[PDB]
Design a protein around this ligand. Sequence first.
Ligand SMILES: OC[C@H]1O[C@H](O)[C@H](O)[C@@H](O)[C@@H]1O
Lengths: 160, 160
Amino acid sequence: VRGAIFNMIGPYFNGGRVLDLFAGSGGLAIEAVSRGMSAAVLVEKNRKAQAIIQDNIIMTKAENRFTLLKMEAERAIDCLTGRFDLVFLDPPYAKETIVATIEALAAKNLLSEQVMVVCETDKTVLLPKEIATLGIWKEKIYGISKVTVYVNEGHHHHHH
Amino acid sequence: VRGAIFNMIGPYFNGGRVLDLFAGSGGLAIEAVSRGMSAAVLVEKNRKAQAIIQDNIIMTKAENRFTLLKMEAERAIDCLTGRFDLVFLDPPYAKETIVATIEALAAKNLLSEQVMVVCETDKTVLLPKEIATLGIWKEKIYGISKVTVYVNEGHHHHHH
Ligand SMILES: OC[C@H]1O[C@H](O)[C@H](O)[C@@H](O)[C@@H]1O
């Protein structure tokens, strides 16, 4: 569904910083940078996922644009600084706390003025229309998952 | 002071990852990227230093190349994953912390084969010739400071 997600929020980007809080294989972050983002911070504590991410980043030929952090998402939010323009939140079902996480990101001033938060959850997960200062821009349900995209009030339209 | 330091280890670089522990104002990491390093991870626990770093990062017009972590160096090392090509160390309890930090970095396999670990300390601080698998390559004293650079046994000779 990589192409599906990017057809929603992209397909191409104008640079910026990406935060992938539950990076997994690194797919989301890597493709985002590929499609136009400048750099990406990937957070994934899963030992097995690490090796895969490492290899995927090296295969991009622009590996230095990726920073992998082996830590819990909550911990990462309390240690990262600066601001992110695109945030990917695809937590495993049992650890999913989209609302709390976005509120934390906003409270820690980790979101850029023009920010987009892409959430991937089970199809059955209901999310509020507004979280912090963000609002749902798009929501698509395909297969057993649902992708919900939050953006800041006044987020600029995407250029085609 | 930076001109002297970089004439020792540079003066230019063709890409790579920088790690600036006990970053302070982040001056070394920023200059290293300006000279050719690809990206930098800076770790600084002090709140005032963090503010300064964030501001300096903006003045580079290439802020997307920096990742600032607000955490203890020890904690940071346990969360880092990529191999680093250039490491800057200027910590409190210099001699003690430099040895412990290099030992930790080496144990976590966070140093590239051709890594340069650059230590800036008071002129009187005496550092050991060897730490873990590293050894002193260069050491220069000027003004009221001393720069010591550690490298791995297989470090390649540098150009002039
Ligand atoms: O927040 C989303 C926006 O982030 C950055 O500004 C990107 O350059 C832009 O392409 C993207 O639409």
